PDB file of all heavy atoms in Angstrom:
ATOM      1  N   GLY Z 658     -13.550 -16.181   8.413  1.00 30.15           N
ATOM      2  CA  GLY Z 658     -12.121 -15.956   8.359  1.00 30.15           C
ATOM      3  C   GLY Z 658     -11.726 -14.493   8.296  1.00 30.15           C
ATOM      4  O   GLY Z 658     -12.544 -13.582   8.198  1.00 30.15           O
ATOM      5  N   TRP Z 659     -10.413 -14.285   8.342  1.00 30.27           N
ATOM      6  CA  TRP Z 659      -9.813 -12.962   8.386  1.00 30.27           C
ATOM      7  C   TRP Z 659      -8.680 -12.874   7.378  1.00 30.27           C
ATOM      8  O   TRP Z 659      -8.075 -13.883   7.004  1.00 30.27           O
ATOM      9  CB  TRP Z 659      -9.287 -12.629   9.785  1.00 30.27           C
ATOM     10  CG  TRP Z 659     -10.347 -12.662  10.819  1.00 30.27           C
ATOM     11  CD1 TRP Z 659     -10.720 -13.733  11.568  1.00 30.27           C
ATOM     12  CD2 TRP Z 659     -11.178 -11.572  11.230  1.00 30.27           C
ATOM     13  NE1 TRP Z 659     -11.741 -13.384  12.415  1.00 30.27           N
ATOM     14  CE2 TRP Z 659     -12.038 -12.059  12.229  1.00 30.27           C
ATOM     15  CE3 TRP Z 659     -11.279 -10.231  10.848  1.00 30.27           C
ATOM     16  CZ2 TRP Z 659     -12.987 -11.256  12.852  1.00 30.27           C
ATOM     17  CZ3 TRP Z 659     -12.224  -9.435  11.465  1.00 30.27           C
ATOM     18  CH2 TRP Z 659     -13.065  -9.949  12.458  1.00 30.27           C
ATOM     19  N   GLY Z 660      -8.396 -11.651   6.949  1.00 26.12           N
ATOM     20  CA  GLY Z 660      -7.351 -11.398   5.987  1.00 26.12           C
ATOM     21  C   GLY Z 660      -5.965 -11.541   6.589  1.00 26.12           C
ATOM     22  O   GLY Z 660      -5.760 -12.065   7.684  1.00 26.12           O
ATOM     23  N   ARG Z 661      -4.982 -11.094   5.813  1.00 20.87           N
ATOM     24  CA  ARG Z 661      -3.609 -11.080   6.295  1.00 20.87           C
ATOM     25  C   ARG Z 661      -3.201  -9.744   6.900  1.00 20.87           C
ATOM     26  O   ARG Z 661      -2.264  -9.708   7.704  1.00 20.87           O
ATOM     27  CB  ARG Z 661      -2.651 -11.437   5.158  1.00 20.87           C
ATOM     28  N   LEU Z 662      -3.877  -8.651   6.549  1.00 20.88           N
ATOM     29  CA  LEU Z 662      -3.334  -7.323   6.794  1.00 20.88           C
ATOM     30  C   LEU Z 662      -4.379  -6.431   7.449  1.00 20.88           C
ATOM     31  O   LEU Z 662      -5.572  -6.740   7.470  1.00 20.88           O
ATOM     32  CB  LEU Z 662      -2.866  -6.668   5.494  1.00 20.88           C
ATOM     33  CG  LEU Z 662      -1.948  -7.472   4.574  1.00 20.88           C
ATOM     34  CD1 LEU Z 662      -1.698  -6.680   3.305  1.00 20.88           C
ATOM     35  CD2 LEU Z 662      -0.649  -7.886   5.251  1.00 20.88           C
ATOM     36  N   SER Z 663      -3.906  -5.312   7.989  1.00 22.61           N
ATOM     37  CA  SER Z 663      -4.758  -4.306   8.605  1.00 22.61           C
ATOM     38  C   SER Z 663      -5.014  -3.140   7.656  1.00 22.61           C
ATOM     39  O   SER Z 663      -4.241  -2.881   6.732  1.00 22.61           O
ATOM     40  CB  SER Z 663      -4.122  -3.785   9.890  1.00 22.61           C
ATOM     41  OG  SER Z 663      -2.862  -3.196   9.624  1.00 22.61           O
ATOM     42  N   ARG Z 664      -6.103  -2.412   7.933  1.00 19.87           N
ATOM     43  CA  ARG Z 664      -6.484  -1.235   7.151  1.00 19.87           C
ATOM     44  C   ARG Z 664      -5.380  -0.184   7.121  1.00 19.87           C
ATOM     45  O   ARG Z 664      -5.076   0.386   6.062  1.00 19.87           O
ATOM     46  CB  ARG Z 664      -7.757  -0.626   7.736  1.00 19.87           C
ATOM     47  CG  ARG Z 664      -8.213   0.644   7.047  1.00 19.87           C
ATOM     48  CD  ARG Z 664      -9.498   1.152   7.672  1.00 19.87           C
ATOM     49  NE  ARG Z 664      -9.876   2.467   7.168  1.00 19.87           N
ATOM     50  CZ  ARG Z 664     -10.557   2.678   6.051  1.00 19.87           C
ATOM     51  NH1 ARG Z 664     -10.947   1.675   5.281  1.00 19.87           N
ATOM     52  NH2 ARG Z 664     -10.853   3.926   5.697  1.00 19.87           N
ATOM     53  N   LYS Z 665      -4.784   0.094   8.285  1.00 22.20           N
ATOM     54  CA  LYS Z 665      -3.711   1.079   8.382  1.00 22.20           C
ATOM     55  C   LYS Z 665      -2.507   0.685   7.535  1.00 22.20           C
ATOM     56  O   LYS Z 665      -1.725   1.547   7.120  1.00 22.20           O
ATOM     57  CB  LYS Z 665      -3.300   1.265   9.844  1.00 22.20           C
ATOM     58  N   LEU Z 666      -2.316  -0.610   7.294  1.00 20.25           N
ATOM     59  CA  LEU Z 666      -1.199  -1.019   6.453  1.00 20.25           C
ATOM     60  C   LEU Z 666      -1.536  -0.840   4.974  1.00 20.25           C
ATOM     61  O   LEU Z 666      -0.740  -0.273   4.217  1.00 20.25           O
ATOM     62  CB  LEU Z 666      -0.799  -2.461   6.773  1.00 20.25           C
ATOM     63  CG  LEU Z 666       0.048  -3.304   5.811  1.00 20.25           C
ATOM     64  CD1 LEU Z 666       1.345  -2.603   5.404  1.00 20.25           C
ATOM     65  CD2 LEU Z 666       0.386  -4.607   6.484  1.00 20.25           C
ATOM     66  N   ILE Z 667      -2.709  -1.317   4.537  1.00 22.82           N
ATOM     67  CA  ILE Z 667      -3.021  -1.291   3.106  1.00 22.82           C
ATOM     68  C   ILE Z 667      -3.304   0.126   2.624  1.00 22.82           C
ATOM     69  O   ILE Z 667      -2.691   0.601   1.662  1.00 22.82           O
ATOM     70  CB  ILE Z 667      -4.197  -2.224   2.760  1.00 22.82           C
ATOM     71  CG1 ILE Z 667      -4.008  -3.638   3.307  1.00 22.82           C
ATOM     72  CG2 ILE Z 667      -4.431  -2.236   1.267  1.00 22.82           C
ATOM     73  CD1 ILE Z 667      -5.224  -4.175   4.014  1.00 22.82           C
ATOM     74  N   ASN Z 668      -4.240   0.825   3.260  1.00 18.66           N
ATOM     75  CA  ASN Z 668      -4.588   2.137   2.726  1.00 18.66           C
ATOM     76  C   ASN Z 668      -4.592   3.152   3.863  1.00 18.66           C
ATOM     77  O   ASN Z 668      -5.480   4.005   3.971  1.00 18.66           O
ATOM     78  CB  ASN Z 668      -5.919   2.095   1.970  1.00 18.66           C
ATOM     79  CG  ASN Z 668      -6.168   3.346   1.146  1.00 18.66           C
ATOM     80  OD1 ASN Z 668      -5.254   3.870   0.507  1.00 18.66           O
ATOM     81  ND2 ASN Z 668      -7.409   3.810   1.132  1.00 18.66           N
ATOM     82  N   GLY Z 669      -3.599   3.039   4.734  1.00 20.81           N
ATOM     83  CA  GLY Z 669      -3.336   3.948   5.826  1.00 20.81           C
ATOM     84  C   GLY Z 669      -2.023   4.664   5.600  1.00 20.81           C
ATOM     85  O   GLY Z 669      -1.985   5.741   4.996  1.00 20.81           O
ATOM     86  N   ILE Z 670      -0.959   4.062   6.150  1.00 22.27           N
ATOM     87  CA  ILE Z 670       0.398   4.603   6.122  1.00 22.27           C
ATOM     88  C   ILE Z 670       0.808   5.034   4.716  1.00 22.27           C
ATOM     89  O   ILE Z 670       0.527   4.353   3.722  1.00 22.27           O
ATOM     90  CB  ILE Z 670       1.356   3.539   6.687  1.00 22.27           C
ATOM     91  CG1 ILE Z 670       0.947   3.164   8.113  1.00 22.27           C
ATOM     92  CG2 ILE Z 670       2.799   4.012   6.681  1.00 22.27           C
ATOM     93  CD1 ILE Z 670       0.834   4.347   9.046  1.00 22.27           C
ATOM     94  N   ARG Z 671       1.475   6.186   4.637  1.00 22.80           N
ATOM     95  CA  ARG Z 671       1.749   6.888   3.393  1.00 22.80           C
ATOM     96  C   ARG Z 671       3.217   7.284   3.357  1.00 22.80           C
ATOM     97  O   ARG Z 671       3.779   7.690   4.378  1.00 22.80           O
ATOM     98  CB  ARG Z 671       0.848   8.127   3.278  1.00 22.80           C
ATOM     99  CG  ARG Z 671       1.195   9.111   2.176  1.00 22.80           C
ATOM    100  CD  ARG Z 671       0.022  10.036   1.875  1.00 22.80           C
ATOM    101  NE  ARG Z 671      -0.532  10.648   3.079  1.00 22.80           N
ATOM    102  CZ  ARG Z 671      -1.725  10.369   3.584  1.00 22.80           C
ATOM    103  NH1 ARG Z 671      -2.518   9.467   3.029  1.00 22.80           N
ATOM    104  NH2 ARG Z 671      -2.129  11.003   4.682  1.00 22.80           N
ATOM    105  N   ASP Z 672       3.838   7.146   2.186  1.00 23.35           N
ATOM    106  CA  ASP Z 672       5.241   7.509   2.033  1.00 23.35           C
ATOM    107  C   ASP Z 672       5.411   9.019   2.123  1.00 23.35           C
ATOM    108  O   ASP Z 672       4.658   9.778   1.508  1.00 23.35           O
ATOM    109  CB  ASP Z 672       5.778   6.999   0.696  1.00 23.35           C
ATOM    110  N   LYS Z 673       6.395   9.457   2.911  1.00 24.93           N
ATOM    111  CA  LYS Z 673       6.682  10.885   2.995  1.00 24.93           C
ATOM    112  C   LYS Z 673       7.283  11.413   1.698  1.00 24.93           C
ATOM    113  O   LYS Z 673       7.062  12.576   1.345  1.00 24.93           O
ATOM    114  CB  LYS Z 673       7.617  11.167   4.169  1.00 24.93           C
ATOM    115  N   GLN Z 674       8.044  10.584   0.984  1.00 27.97           N
ATOM    116  CA  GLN Z 674       8.627  11.024  -0.279  1.00 27.97           C
ATOM    117  C   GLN Z 674       7.586  11.033  -1.393  1.00 27.97           C
ATOM    118  O   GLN Z 674       7.473  12.011  -2.142  1.00 27.97           O
ATOM    119  CB  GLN Z 674       9.809  10.125  -0.650  1.00 27.97           C
ATOM    120  CG  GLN Z 674      10.511  10.511  -1.944  1.00 27.97           C
ATOM    121  CD  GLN Z 674      10.081   9.665  -3.127  1.00 27.97           C
ATOM    122  OE1 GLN Z 674      10.434   8.490  -3.226  1.00 27.97           O
ATOM    123  NE2 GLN Z 674       9.317  10.262  -4.036  1.00 27.97           N
ATOM    124  N   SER Z 675       6.819   9.951  -1.520  1.00 28.63           N
ATOM    125  CA  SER Z 675       5.895   9.798  -2.636  1.00 28.63           C
ATOM    126  C   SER Z 675       4.517  10.386  -2.369  1.00 28.63           C
ATOM    127  O   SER Z 675       3.862  10.850  -3.308  1.00 28.63           O
ATOM    128  CB  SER Z 675       5.745   8.317  -2.998  1.00 28.63           C
ATOM    129  OG  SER Z 675       7.005   7.723  -3.256  1.00 28.63           O
ATOM    130  N   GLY Z 676       4.059  10.380  -1.121  1.00 28.78           N
ATOM    131  CA  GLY Z 676       2.700  10.801  -0.842  1.00 28.78           C
ATOM    132  C   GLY Z 676       1.647   9.799  -1.257  1.00 28.78           C
ATOM    133  O   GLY Z 676       0.505  10.184  -1.521  1.00 28.78           O
ATOM    134  N   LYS Z 677       2.004   8.519  -1.325  1.00 27.33           N
ATOM    135  CA  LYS Z 677       1.086   7.458  -1.704  1.00 27.33           C
ATOM    136  C   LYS Z 677       1.085   6.362  -0.645  1.00 27.33           C
ATOM    137  O   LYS Z 677       2.094   6.122   0.025  1.00 27.33           O
ATOM    138  CB  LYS Z 677       1.465   6.865  -3.068  1.00 27.33           C
ATOM    139  N   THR Z 678      -0.064   5.706  -0.488  1.00 30.18           N
ATOM    140  CA  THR Z 678      -0.166   4.537   0.372  1.00 30.18           C
ATOM    141  C   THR Z 678       0.289   3.285  -0.378  1.00 30.18           C
ATOM    142  O   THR Z 678       0.765   3.345  -1.515  1.00 30.18           O
ATOM    143  CB  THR Z 678      -1.597   4.350   0.876  1.00 30.18           C
ATOM    144  OG1 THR Z 678      -2.438   3.936  -0.208  1.00 30.18           O
ATOM    145  CG2 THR Z 678      -2.134   5.648   1.460  1.00 30.18           C
ATOM    146  N   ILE Z 679       0.170   2.138   0.297  1.00 30.85           N
ATOM    147  CA  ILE Z 679       0.347   0.850  -0.372  1.00 30.85           C
ATOM    148  C   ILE Z 679      -0.675   0.690  -1.490  1.00 30.85           C
ATOM    149  O   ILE Z 679      -0.331   0.359  -2.631  1.00 30.85           O
ATOM    150  CB  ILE Z 679       0.238  -0.304   0.642  1.00 30.85           C
ATOM    151  CG1 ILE Z 679       1.324  -0.226   1.716  1.00 30.85           C
ATOM    152  CG2 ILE Z 679       0.254  -1.648  -0.080  1.00 30.85           C
ATOM    153  CD1 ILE Z 679       2.695  -0.484   1.203  1.00 30.85           C
ATOM    154  N   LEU Z 680      -1.952   0.925  -1.174  1.00 31.20           N
ATOM    155  CA  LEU Z 680      -3.009   0.725  -2.159  1.00 31.20           C
ATOM    156  C   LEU Z 680      -2.911   1.747  -3.287  1.00 31.20           C
ATOM    157  O   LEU Z 680      -3.263   1.449  -4.432  1.00 31.20           O
ATOM    158  CB  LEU Z 680      -4.382   0.788  -1.488  1.00 31.20           C
ATOM    159  CG  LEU Z 680      -5.574   0.536  -2.419  1.00 31.20           C
ATOM    160  CD1 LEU Z 680      -5.513  -0.864  -3.037  1.00 31.20           C
ATOM    161  CD2 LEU Z 680      -6.891   0.769  -1.722  1.00 31.20           C
ATOM    162  N   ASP Z 681      -2.443   2.960  -2.981  1.00 31.99           N
ATOM    163  CA  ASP Z 681      -2.202   3.942  -4.034  1.00 31.99           C
ATOM    164  C   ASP Z 681      -1.122   3.471  -5.001  1.00 31.99           C
ATOM    165  O   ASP Z 681      -1.269   3.611  -6.220  1.00 31.99           O
ATOM    166  CB  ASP Z 681      -1.821   5.290  -3.427  1.00 31.99           C
ATOM    167  CG  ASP Z 681      -2.920   5.870  -2.568  1.00 31.99           C
ATOM    168  OD1 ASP Z 681      -4.096   5.526  -2.802  1.00 31.99           O
ATOM    169  OD2 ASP Z 681      -2.609   6.675  -1.667  1.00 31.99           O
ATOM    170  N   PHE Z 682      -0.029   2.912  -4.474  1.00 33.83           N
ATOM    171  CA  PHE Z 682       1.042   2.420  -5.335  1.00 33.83           C
ATOM    172  C   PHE Z 682       0.589   1.215  -6.152  1.00 33.83           C
ATOM    173  O   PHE Z 682       0.992   1.056  -7.310  1.00 33.83           O
ATOM    174  CB  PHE Z 682       2.274   2.079  -4.499  1.00 33.83           C
ATOM    175  N   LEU Z 683      -0.236   0.346  -5.558  1.00 37.43           N
ATOM    176  CA  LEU Z 683      -0.805  -0.764  -6.319  1.00 37.43           C
ATOM    177  C   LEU Z 683      -1.749  -0.266  -7.407  1.00 37.43           C
ATOM    178  O   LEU Z 683      -1.735  -0.778  -8.532  1.00 37.43           O
ATOM    179  CB  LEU Z 683      -1.537  -1.727  -5.384  1.00 37.43           C
ATOM    180  CG  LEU Z 683      -0.741  -2.415  -4.273  1.00 37.43           C
ATOM    181  CD1 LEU Z 683      -1.641  -3.331  -3.464  1.00 37.43           C
ATOM    182  CD2 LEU Z 683       0.432  -3.186  -4.845  1.00 37.43           C
ATOM    183  N   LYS Z 684      -2.576   0.732  -7.089  1.00 34.74           N
ATOM    184  CA  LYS Z 684      -3.590   1.225  -8.015  1.00 34.74           C
ATOM    185  C   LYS Z 684      -2.980   2.101  -9.101  1.00 34.74           C
ATOM    186  O   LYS Z 684      -3.371   2.015 -10.270  1.00 34.74           O
ATOM    187  CB  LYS Z 684      -4.665   1.994  -7.244  1.00 34.74           C
ATOM    188  CG  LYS Z 684      -5.806   2.524  -8.097  1.00 34.74           C
ATOM    189  CD  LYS Z 684      -6.778   3.330  -7.251  1.00 34.74           C
ATOM    190  CE  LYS Z 684      -7.431   2.454  -6.193  1.00 34.74           C
ATOM    191  NZ  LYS Z 684      -8.470   3.172  -5.407  1.00 34.74           N
ATOM    192  N   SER Z 685      -2.041   2.969  -8.735  1.00 32.35           N
ATOM    193  CA  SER Z 685      -1.348   3.779  -9.725  1.00 32.35           C
ATOM    194  C   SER Z 685      -0.260   2.955 -10.412  1.00 32.35           C
ATOM    195  O   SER Z 685      -0.152   1.737 -10.238  1.00 32.35           O
ATOM    196  CB  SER Z 685      -0.758   5.031  -9.080  1.00 32.35           C
ATOM    197  OG  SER Z 685      -0.249   5.914 -10.064  1.00 32.35           O
ATOM    198  N   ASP Z 686       0.545   3.639 -11.230  1.00 33.23           N
ATOM    199  CA  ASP Z 686       1.681   2.983 -11.869  1.00 33.23           C
ATOM    200  C   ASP Z 686       2.702   2.516 -10.837  1.00 33.23           C
ATOM    201  O   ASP Z 686       3.281   1.431 -10.975  1.00 33.23           O
ATOM    202  CB  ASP Z 686       2.330   3.927 -12.882  1.00 33.23           C
ATOM    203  N   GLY Z 687       2.919   3.312  -9.790  1.00 36.11           N
ATOM    204  CA  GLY Z 687       3.886   2.982  -8.760  1.00 36.11           C
ATOM    205  C   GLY Z 687       5.299   2.979  -9.301  1.00 36.11           C
ATOM    206  O   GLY Z 687       5.974   1.944  -9.268  1.00 36.11           O
ATOM    207  N   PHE Z 688       5.745   4.142  -9.786  1.00 36.27           N
ATOM    208  CA  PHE Z 688       6.962   4.305 -10.599  1.00 36.27           C
ATOM    209  C   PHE Z 688       6.836   3.339 -11.778  1.00 36.27           C
ATOM    210  O   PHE Z 688       5.782   3.320 -12.431  1.00 36.27           O
ATOM    211  CB  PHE Z 688       8.209   4.142  -9.736  1.00 36.27           C
ATOM    212  N   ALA Z 689       7.860   2.546 -12.098  1.00 38.37           N
ATOM    213  CA  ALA Z 689       7.679   1.508 -13.106  1.00 38.37           C
ATOM    214  C   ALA Z 689       6.755   0.411 -12.595  1.00 38.37           C
ATOM    215  O   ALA Z 689       5.745   0.089 -13.232  1.00 38.37           O
ATOM    216  CB  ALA Z 689       9.033   0.931 -13.517  1.00 38.37           C
ATOM    217  N   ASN Z 690       7.068  -0.149 -11.427  1.00 39.17           N
ATOM    218  CA  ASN Z 690       6.251  -1.193 -10.827  1.00 39.17           C
ATOM    219  C   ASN Z 690       6.609  -1.320  -9.355  1.00 39.17           C
ATOM    220  O   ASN Z 690       7.755  -1.100  -8.954  1.00 39.17           O
ATOM    221  CB  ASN Z 690       6.442  -2.538 -11.537  1.00 39.17           C
ATOM    222  CG  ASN Z 690       5.226  -3.422 -11.434  1.00 39.17           C
ATOM    223  OD1 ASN Z 690       4.367  -3.204 -10.585  1.00 39.17           O
ATOM    224  ND2 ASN Z 690       5.140  -4.426 -12.301  1.00 39.17           N
ATOM    225  N   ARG Z 691       5.611  -1.698  -8.557  1.00 37.53           N
ATOM    226  CA  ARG Z 691       5.823  -1.966  -7.141  1.00 37.53           C
ATOM    227  C   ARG Z 691       4.753  -2.905  -6.599  1.00 37.53           C
ATOM    228  O   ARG Z 691       3.598  -2.503  -6.428  1.00 37.53           O
ATOM    229  CB  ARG Z 691       5.832  -0.658  -6.345  1.00 37.53           C
ATOM    230  N   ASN Z 692       5.137  -4.143  -6.275  1.00 34.34           N
ATOM    231  CA  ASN Z 692       4.165  -5.086  -5.658  1.00 34.34           C
ATOM    232  C   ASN Z 692       4.056  -4.776  -4.162  1.00 34.34           C
ATOM    233  O   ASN Z 692       4.961  -4.114  -3.634  1.00 34.34           O
ATOM    234  CB  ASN Z 692       4.561  -6.547  -5.875  1.00 34.34           C
ATOM    235  N   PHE Z 693       2.994  -5.253  -3.508  1.00 35.96           N
ATOM    236  CA  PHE Z 693       2.854  -5.042  -2.045  1.00 35.96           C
ATOM    237  C   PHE Z 693       4.131  -5.517  -1.347  1.00 35.96           C
ATOM    238  O   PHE Z 693       4.751  -4.726  -0.617  1.00 35.96           O
ATOM    239  CB  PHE Z 693       1.641  -5.790  -1.488  1.00 35.96           C
ATOM    240  CG  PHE Z 693       1.679  -5.973   0.008  1.00 35.96           C
ATOM    241  CD1 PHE Z 693       1.677  -4.878   0.856  1.00 35.96           C
ATOM    242  CD2 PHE Z 693       1.740  -7.238   0.567  1.00 35.96           C
ATOM    243  CE1 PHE Z 693       1.727  -5.043   2.229  1.00 35.96           C
ATOM    244  CE2 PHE Z 693       1.790  -7.404   1.942  1.00 35.96           C
ATOM    245  CZ  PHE Z 693       1.785  -6.306   2.771  1.00 35.96           C
ATOM    246  N   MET Z 694       4.495  -6.784  -1.556  1.00 34.42           N
ATOM    247  CA  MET Z 694       5.733  -7.330  -0.944  1.00 34.42           C
ATOM    248  C   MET Z 694       6.882  -6.360  -1.218  1.00 34.42           C
ATOM    249  O   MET Z 694       7.577  -5.982  -0.259  1.00 34.42           O
ATOM    250  CB  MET Z 694       6.072  -8.696  -1.541  1.00 34.42           C
ATOM    251  CG  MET Z 694       5.179  -9.805  -1.031  1.00 34.42           C
ATOM    252  SD  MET Z 694       4.625  -9.496   0.663  1.00 34.42           S
ATOM    253  CE  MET Z 694       6.006 -10.167   1.588  1.00 34.42           C
ATOM    254  N   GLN Z 695       7.068  -5.985  -2.487  1.00 33.98           N
ATOM    255  CA  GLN Z 695       8.139  -5.021  -2.845  1.00 33.98           C
ATOM    256  C   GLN Z 695       7.956  -3.759  -2.000  1.00 33.98           C
ATOM    257  O   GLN Z 695       8.887  -3.410  -1.258  1.00 33.98           O
ATOM    258  CB  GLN Z 695       8.088  -4.699  -4.339  1.00 33.98           C
ATOM    259  N   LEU Z 696       6.789  -3.119  -2.099  1.00 31.02           N
ATOM    260  CA  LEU Z 696       6.521  -1.870  -1.339  1.00 31.02           C
ATOM    261  C   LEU Z 696       6.989  -2.034   0.109  1.00 31.02           C
ATOM    262  O   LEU Z 696       7.622  -1.101   0.637  1.00 31.02           O
ATOM    263  CB  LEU Z 696       5.019  -1.586  -1.394  1.00 31.02           C
ATOM    264  CG  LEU Z 696       4.526  -0.983  -2.705  1.00 31.02           C
ATOM    265  CD1 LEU Z 696       3.016  -1.107  -2.823  1.00 31.02           C
ATOM    266  CD2 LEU Z 696       4.961   0.468  -2.818  1.00 31.02           C
ATOM    267  N   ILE Z 697       6.663  -3.168   0.730  1.00 30.26           N
ATOM    268  CA  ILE Z 697       7.072  -3.415   2.143  1.00 30.26           C
ATOM    269  C   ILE Z 697       8.598  -3.524   2.192  1.00 30.26           C
ATOM    270  O   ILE Z 697       9.227  -2.693   2.876  1.00 30.26           O
ATOM    271  CB  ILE Z 697       6.391  -4.683   2.695  1.00 30.26           C
TER     272      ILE Z 697
END
């Protein structure tokens, strides 16, 4: 089987304001909180 997402989505694309990826926001505090769905 295969996952739901691509590498470029999870730990690729990075916020210009924050300088963090999706996985960075999940791994760090991510301001108060930020789920993947939320991040998207």
Side-chain angles (χ1 to χ4, degrees), residues 658-660 662-664 666-671 674-676 678-681 683-685 687 689-690 693-694 696:
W659 301 91
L662 310 176
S663 60
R664 177 179 172 84
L666 162 53
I667 309 133
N668 193 41
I670 301 306
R671 168 162 50 249
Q674 181 261 288
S675 305
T678 70
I679 298 292
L680 182 61
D681 298 335
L683 299 180
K684 182 183 297 184
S685 188
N690 208 342
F693 162 62
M694 285 329 275
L696 282 164

